[PDB]
């Protein structure tokens, strides 16, 4: 459960990402399949080749989903229903995998925003992602 | 663990890493990001805040020791089990650090390199690095498994 | 996050516990200390002896917290504010410990309530105890 | 691992466990309690509700097989790593079960035995048993360590 400060820091961080949210989105997926190959077993129908337009377009979708979450930090369950439905009920994604993408995203954000990626922001973003992850991995419908 | 091809890339990039700075940053991020880890570092003094943590001299001092043992791990990369057997005995048997925390550090370590190197620390190069940090984590957790 | 069925289940099961919650709370603590000795390092000032006055007296406490939490399933952060402060800010409990206590409690409940401890009830209480542990380990001041 | 005692006490308790019924329950409680685990069990048919899962024949039968290798690892508590080497390879290399689930199952097994044996499953007997399912969860994870 996030502080007022954590939600402050998440908003701040996400303004900076701004319009490269899709870009960072793609890069984090790209880093996750590379670093953690088992995650690929969830995308058997994907072009998982380096530079695949398919991975790029999906990162757009994932970042677009996170930006929705940043605007609805007080009711993530409500915002992310349709997405829990997918991740928990239909896809049945092992919880550890959400750790792997979260880490990846953090890696991504760090390398593009060294100045803004302060340890405090790091802490808040970490909490944010663990919160999103709990949502997509609970069956609450 | 790594092939020869990967083991070289990892050694070249690691050569470029500023041990003073990176070790302290990683330790401090760890204390800041997973606040319960602070309980192992009470003696360390004021760890009330981010500013406090990051600027604590003992933190900075300790970070170095840690990165130093890592740099050594990077020299015995095929026998990490052996290289870390002492440290496994200390962290596990004496300190009682739960081994889930060793993953956290290695992960924090990865985010720090990426902060300090940006585009230089590539998807390709990070992947290889995650295998290192997992080995060292596994090696550290040896007294349990 | 809890579904409406999860809340029902917890309410129902926590009710069946009724007047035996202090006892079970004590049994859970004994079982955690015994199976997972590292947890005892959080109680160096306690007599963790079999049948301790102090363990028993604590087990009453932890159960009365969970009874209150069961009455406030909609607002655990609001309900458990002071207990987060203690467990999160003051004691800095490594979250692995919360898992070991939640396991311990479930093992207790199963042995005392075999007919009532269904896999549906078991699932709902698992998620409930995960929610509580999140709050108690969160710094949302 | 266990000592002479922890070992003979644990072995005795185990003689009282009906493997047929207890395996099916544990496997089913895994699938219901930690429902991402169902994704490994797609071929098993309908897993849509708790009753479906519990009443599923494929689950029970598989549950039987699960406890069998457990009874087995009880007969080889000394060398769990050797005991579980094939299953380690199958789960780890061919099914890619995150080792985290080995621990869940071991824990779910513990709660099942407590359910089935109530006070008989004493705090002291539950303890030696925790070392046992953690021993087992480590040998299967060996192709990750
Ligand atoms: C922060 C965590 C995550 C978020 C926000 C997220 C978000 C999304 C979003 C927005 C979609 C779009 C689907 C649509 O078009 O409606 C999606 C689809 C999907 N997500 Fe995730 N996801 C997350 C984590 C994961 C993880 C860890 C996995 C597996 C490792 C995963 C697997 C999938 C899959 C397999 C799809 C659909 C792929 C397909 O269309 O074939 N998601 N996810
Ligand atoms: C990659 C993981 C780690 C490595 C390589 C590592 C390495 C070391 C080294 C070299 C020392 C000091 C060696 C010596 O002083 O003889 C040390 C001490 C210590 N480590 Fe770590 N360590 C690691 C992880 C951790 C973690 C995750 C924690 C807790 C969060 C931890 C807690 C400690 C503590 C509490 C000390 C002693 C500090 C004191 O004097 O209070 N270690 N570790
Ligand atoms: C469901 C999880 C937990 C609940 C509901 C809970 C509840 C409580 C309560 C009500 C108190 C003290 C208030 C009082 O004593 O008057 C307390 C204190 C404490 N808790 Fe917890 N706690 C939980 C988890 C933990 C865990 C997992 C640990 C560590 C293993 C822990 C360690 C402590 C310690 C060391 C104290 C203070 C000791 C004392 O006052 O004697 N708590 N907890
Ligand atoms: C201690 C834990 C486990 C033990 C002792 C165990 C044991 C076994 C055994 C004996 C088999 C079948 C052997 C054979 O027919 O060749 C098996 C297969 C399987 N296990 Fe497990 N397993 C364990 C954990 C898990 C876990 C945690 C999962 C997933 C959550 C899992 C999923 C599977 C799957 C999908 C198969 C293939 C089953 C089939 O289609 O027949 N296992 N495991």
UniProtKB/Swiss-Prot annotation, chains A, C:
The modification Phosphoserine is found at residues 3, 35, 49, 102, 124, 138. Gene3D superfamilies: Globins (1.10.490.10). The modification Phosphotyrosine is found at residue 24. The modification Phosphothreonine is found at residues 108, 134, 137. Heme b binds at residue 87. Residues 1-141 form the Globin domain. Keywords: Acetylation, Heme, Iron, Metal-binding, Oxygen transport, Phosphoprotein, Transport. Red blood cells. PROSITE patterns: GLOBIN (PS01033). One of its GO terms (molecular function) is oxygen binding. It holds the Pfam family Globin. One of its GO terms (biological process) is hydrogen peroxide catabolic process. Disulfide bonds: none annotated. SUPFAM superfamilies: Globin-like. The modification N6-acetyllysine is found at residue 16. The modification N6-succinyllysine is found at residues 7, 11, 16, 40. Involved in oxygen transport from the lung to the various peripheral tissues. Heterotetramer of two alpha chains and two beta chains. Belongs to the globin family. PANTHER family: HEMOGLOBIN FAMILY MEMBER, HEMOGLOBIN SUBUNIT ALPHA. This is Hemoglobin subunit alpha. It comes from Bos taurus (Bovine). The lineage of its organism: Eukaryota, Metazoa, Chordata, Craniata, Vertebrata. The gene is HBA.
Curated annotation (Swiss-Prot), chains B, D:
Red blood cells. Residues 1-145 form the Globin domain. It comes from the Eukaryota. InterPro entries: Globin, Globin-like_sf, Globin/Proto, Hemoglobin_b, Hemoglobin_oxygen_transport. Changing residue 131 to Q: In allele C-Rhodesia. The modification Phosphoserine is found at residue 43. The modification N6-acetyllysine is found at residues 58, 81. Heme b binds at residues 62, 91. The modification Phosphothreonine is found at residue 11. Keywords: Acetylation, Heme, Iron, Metal-binding, Oxygen transport, Phosphoprotein, S-nitrosylation, Transport. Belongs to the globin family. Heterotetramer of two alpha chains and two beta chains. Involved in oxygen transport from the lung to the various peripheral tissues. This is Hemoglobin subunit beta.
């Amino acid at each position: 459960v996030l502080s007022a400060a954590d939600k402050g820091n998440v908003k701040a961080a996400w303004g900076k990402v701004g319009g490269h949210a899709a870009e960072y989105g793609a890069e984090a997926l790209e880093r996750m399949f590379l670093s953690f190959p088992t995650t690929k077993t969830y995308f058997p129908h994907f072009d998982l080749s380096h530079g695949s337009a398919q991975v790029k377009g999906h990162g757009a979708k994932v970042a677009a989903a996170l930006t929705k979450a940043v605007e609805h930090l007080d009711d993530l369950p409500g915002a992310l229903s349709e997405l829990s439905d997918l991740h928990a009920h239909k896809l049945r994604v092992d919880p550890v995998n959400f750790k792997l993408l979260s880490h990846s995203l953090l890696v991504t954000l760090a390398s593009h925003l060294p100045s803004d990626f302060t340890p405090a922001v790091h802490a808040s973003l970490d909490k944010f992602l663990a919160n999103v992850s709990t949502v997509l991995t609970s069956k609450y419908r | 663990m790594l092939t020869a091809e990967e083991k070289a890339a990892v050694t070249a990039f690691w050569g470029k890493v500023k041990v003073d700075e990176v070790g302290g940053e990683a330790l401090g991020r760890l204390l800041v990001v997973y606040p319960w880890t602070q309980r192992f570092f009470e003696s360390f003094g004021d760890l009330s805040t981010a500013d406090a943590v990051m600027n604590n001299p003992k933190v900075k001092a300790h970070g170095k020791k840690v990165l130093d043992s890592f740099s050594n791990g990077m020299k015995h990369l095929d026998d990490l089990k052996g290289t870390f057997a002492a440290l496994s005995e200390l962290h596990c048997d004496k300190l009682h650090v739960d081994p889930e925390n060793f993953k956290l550090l290695g992960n924090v370590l990865v985010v720090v390199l990426a902060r300090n190197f940006g585009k230089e620390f590539t998807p390709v190069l990070q992947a290889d690095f995650q295998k290192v940090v997992a080995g060292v984590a596994n090696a550290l957790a040896h007294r349990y498994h």
